[PDB]
Design a protein around this ligand. Sequence first.
Ligand code: HEM
Ligand code: HEM
Ligand code: NA
Ligand code: NA
Ligand SMILES: [O]
Ligand SMILES: [O]
Lengths: 713, 713
Amino acid sequence: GTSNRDWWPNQLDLSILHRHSSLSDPMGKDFNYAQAFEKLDLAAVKRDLHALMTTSQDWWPADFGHYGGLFIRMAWHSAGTYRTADGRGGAGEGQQRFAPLNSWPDNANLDKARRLLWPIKQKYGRAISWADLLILTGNVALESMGFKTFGFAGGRADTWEPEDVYWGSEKIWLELSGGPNSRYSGDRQLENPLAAVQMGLIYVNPEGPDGNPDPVAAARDIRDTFARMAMNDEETVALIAGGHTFGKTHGAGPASNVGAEPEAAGIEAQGLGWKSAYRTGKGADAITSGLEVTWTTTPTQWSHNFFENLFGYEWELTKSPAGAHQWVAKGADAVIPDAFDPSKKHRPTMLTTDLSLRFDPAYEKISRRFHENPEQFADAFARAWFKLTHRDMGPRARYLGPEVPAEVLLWQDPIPAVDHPLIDAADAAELKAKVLASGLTVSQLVSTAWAAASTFRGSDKRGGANGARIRLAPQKDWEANQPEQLAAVLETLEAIRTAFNGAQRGGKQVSLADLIVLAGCAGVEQAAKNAGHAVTVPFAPGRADASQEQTDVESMAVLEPVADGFRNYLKGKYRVPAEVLLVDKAQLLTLSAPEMTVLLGGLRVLGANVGQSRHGVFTAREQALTNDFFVNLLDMGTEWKPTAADADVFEGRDRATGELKWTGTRVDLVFGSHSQLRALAEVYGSADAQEKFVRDFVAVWNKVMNLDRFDLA
Amino acid sequence: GTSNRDWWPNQLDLSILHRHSSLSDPMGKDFNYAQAFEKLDLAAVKRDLHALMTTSQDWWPADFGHYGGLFIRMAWHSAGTYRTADGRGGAGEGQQRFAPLNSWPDNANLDKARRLLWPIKQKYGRAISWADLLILTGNVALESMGFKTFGFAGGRADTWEPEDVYWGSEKIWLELSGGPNSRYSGDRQLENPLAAVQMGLIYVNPEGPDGNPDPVAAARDIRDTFARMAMNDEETVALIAGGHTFGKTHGAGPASNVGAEPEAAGIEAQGLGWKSAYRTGKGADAITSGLEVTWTTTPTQWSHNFFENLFGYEWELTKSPAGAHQWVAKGADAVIPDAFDPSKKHRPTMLTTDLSLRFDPAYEKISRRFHENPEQFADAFARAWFKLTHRDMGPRARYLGPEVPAEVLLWQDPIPAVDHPLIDAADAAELKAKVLASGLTVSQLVSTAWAAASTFRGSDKRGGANGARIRLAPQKDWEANQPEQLAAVLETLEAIRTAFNGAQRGGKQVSLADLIVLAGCAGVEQAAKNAGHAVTVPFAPGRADASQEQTDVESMAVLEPVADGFRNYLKGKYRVPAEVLLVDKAQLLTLSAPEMTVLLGGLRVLGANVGQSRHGVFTAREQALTNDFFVNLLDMGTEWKPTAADADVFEGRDRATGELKWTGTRVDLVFGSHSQLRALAEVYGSADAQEKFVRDFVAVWNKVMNLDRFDLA
Ligand code: HEM
Ligand code: HEM
Ligand code: NA
Ligand code: NA
Ligand SMILES: [O]
Ligand SMILES: [O]
């Protein structure tokens, strides 16, 4: 069936904004997963998981009698799709059970791991999500084999359809770099937002870069991909060596024996894939990656044998039974146990990427320290495993259950506890009137609150106005935030705060984070008033102010908006059209297409554009909250043409007189071009829509202001 | 960006069930279009439309100073996508303003027509939908030019994204037959459910079949396509000759001058398309179809000139200025006016497909009768125009406003008005006890009510249980309905009715239509009881019984299910896999994926399968309402393989013993294979979900029982 995508493959795709509707969810619209989880007997779930670790099923026999290794890899892969550039991927929505991730080559036989968990999932039902179960199972695997984890938080709600993520443009699974859709350019520069070296891999190729078994070059790819997953050199070494302390790889015969991935398999396979014609197709004959490596002498127990073997031997390049490159310890005894036959033993083996931990000079230093000090190794691995598997969970307020670590970590962008009474509705009214009496304009107030709140992204739940980090490095200096204007607004707001707080009794006070949001609310109310409408913009107090020392400035870098259509801002020239970047921002903000449309039309006429640009400011009453953007955009008495100077800027001229009326960007004019967006603009641009436009604008402004407010959840 | 569709282009697409969510709709979920329309000043809208007809805009000047012909074609095209096979297409959702229909070649320059209506749409806002406006504008164009319409009904609610329709598999616009995705096979057999000869056409090719100018062969395509749009020979002739009394075609220069369709055009085109480099690109220089034909001497007035010219002249094959085939009247004077230049006049011209009305023997007799009896032509065209433009509006109870024709038409599947008191809750209890005491089984009662209610389709709002048409030809004879078993259930129900009705006072009675549904509800209640649950199933009385004479047996043929996954029924072998057909049927029933899942799992265990097939009956307590379908399907202790005798039937065998436990179809197993469907099945298959399953099942059963109940809406 030929689709709109086939006819117009470059047209903007709005469906990504309309995912996760209540139509696709089988739970009541009332279902609260946090409340269900809070009543889960987590201890009982862990005891069941513990038993499962050594209860082999004959349809996928457990290596060494212990599923621990397999489950660790499962939880690692669930988490390891995460990219810092957009926060997409990660373990937080249990997306490994859906396409495409369920069928990535790197996820081969994790279909079997997930199926082994069905009986426990079935037993506990809605009180434990798949997303939480995958991570928990990983933790129980580690604990069952003698490793002390740093902790565990529940609260990852299940989802019911595939997330729309850009994983790359390649049309061939695992395509080597340099093809017609190469994700590499220049001196091996990986395209943002991607965080893996080949389509269908979690991070790097375990044979080495494009299959070239050089551990020094592999180290480069490791370092780059792991950084793009929020991990530094210490965390990377800890994770790889920690993981590869357990279990084994599977490459017992040629890869050609392996059939279709799950999404391609026949219906009868019941959601499993990679059915193998090699001998029994499982157990001792398993083929997963095609590599056949077992790293330690006790694959089912925590030890410091990974580094003892890495540094205790010299390594020789060899081939698995499936033909993959891998390494074997020169002149070693057969000291590594066989996964099924107690009478066989094998020499130590390693991947190319394992050897990176020794042959990269910076990794080597850390690996030596971890070798000499296995207690440091254990603690670094525990912390890194916690971080990895919880990186996309968002603020600490979302962490559920009795194993949540009490130590607050810098990577969490922590928010201090509130220790005083909150402002009430009458206090909020007084503060709004003071803000407005200061002489701050609607434009300044709206632009500042937008800048503070619109850092939120629903992908990993980072950002938002809580914390008042707009006043700290690096946010205060981001170009989109207009650093000089921002400084003058913040100074005036801080003087208002200091006076309000100084006047109170009982220790009531207002945070700067709250006041920034409230002040924007006052701006919106005033804009409505300027248009002849009396509205109260909702406001919920309770934000707190974080310090500079509680803010990792380097981690904060990935939240800088280089594209923000809502402020008509583009930091530079990009390959992706601006309107695509707008829909990407809207999705990160959790906005629907109608919410995106209302919000953008209102921001334009409030003065939110960076640098006071007139682009898309289609009104003669700037700073009044009206639907003028839509009425003027849709007026056929205007003709639009790209400018000679810049094809991405358009002039709107009266069709009769030739007089210049307006200018706009692609982000402005798309609402008059795209057939679904223009249908939305028409609603807001109709004669009966001024009151609806105001109400809808206020609702979406409030939604954006509260995106990070999991403390009120 | 490589998508799931690219990787696994044959995987089932569930997004079609989750369209039209409240996320994409800019109106509140409270918005009621019927109530908004009820308050529209329809008279005022029509006066503005009348004014519009001769208010020429310079960006698309009006032919002959009058846009009537253009607007008639617009309305005709809005309605003319309709297919009887599935009820999809038609005017009822205003889908002409979205992709792909906004950019079909046959809809060229209708973007201009719609844009001319923007100021009126704007002025009246939500009180008139685009969908209603398009048809109304057509009506006003006809009235403006002297033709009295049969009527007009509002109530077509606007939609906010493209409908997912199968329009054909061809990858080239207007591809001629016999290509690698040919919609034709055999003796010019058009594939169901299609109702046009080429991708991007409304019905046929105006040059003739695949561009061959033979009017007799063209007539065959016309007859077949129009039949598939619910039009017989009399309605077809009336429509074509009626329509082509007005206006003109546009082919002033070569088609190479015409640019990108709306969905391909530059952003600056602001939703418009087909920008032409031929001379002024518009008006006298317009290029639309590439044909250059004006049919009558008074193109802006109703006349009887179409048939006078058709029969009054002999016709010679010629070429338009764009090179298209068309016909000119042999030795005629220049009697046809020019659309722009009062000093030019033209000979009469016709399309191939117009000549079909004379050279096809059956059309010729009708065309001669219309030529000799212009009153009959008028009334037939008015009736056909009303039918065409309202065919997908559903039951009469949805027709709004003061122009609704009072005459009840057979094509409307009319339901007699109820003229008596309805049963109350005490009566409903007594009828259900009598039903259950009769000895009819759960399986009988469920199967009969499912058969009655599940004829509904939301695409054109035909079918459903109202009317009791299950007792009439042809439904009573359909194989899916199990005619012998059906007759025995209906006989026992009719006896129950006759006794209940005989015993009443005050003229209270129950329809057979109501009783069928109530009896099914008793079946479901009894099934719940069989499983140890106490459940009341909701029931809304008020259906009436239609007669045989009120049920057109030929029109009812297209609602026969050849595929009904909910009864594990397939009438023959098809090119579309069975699970695709299931999702298709779910969409027509207005079900979401979770609703489809729960409903199908419950029907399997209640005994709703046609022929009492065991396929998917995964329970040992048949006729008890449990979630056994899900628990057993998801049991990994069973391995599934296709049977040798039939690759579409599967055997589920114990993994340890090899013993046969169950058999299933693709419709059964898809719920264990597809990754989104299996996530749904898991929810209902969990240990905490038995109560949830029962309640959700009752909700969806009730939904289906009420699908056609617009009398209560
Ligand atoms: C450079 C980064 C990494 C690479 C290239 C890599 C590669 C691989 C490969 C190819 C396999 C074999 C799959 C098979 O055939 O069964 C595997 C197994 C494994 N990996 Fe990794 N890995 C990396 C990092 C990690 C991390 C960060 C963890 C966890 C902290 C982890 C834990 C494991 C475990 C437990 C197994 C054994 C699975 C089993 O016993 O069945 N790996 N790895
Ligand atoms: C055999 C079925 C039909 C065919 C092949 C056909 C074909 C065409 C074509 C090719 C055009 C010219 C488009 C252009 O170049 O601007 C046209 C115009 C038109 N058709 Fe049809 N038509 C059919 C049936 C109908 C019917 C059923 C109606 C209405 C009841 C209708 C009403 C019109 C009108 C009013 C125009 C004139 C448009 C204008 O003045 O701009 N046609 N038709
Ligand atoms: Na994420
Ligand atoms: Na329809
Ligand atoms: O891994
Ligand atoms: O037409």
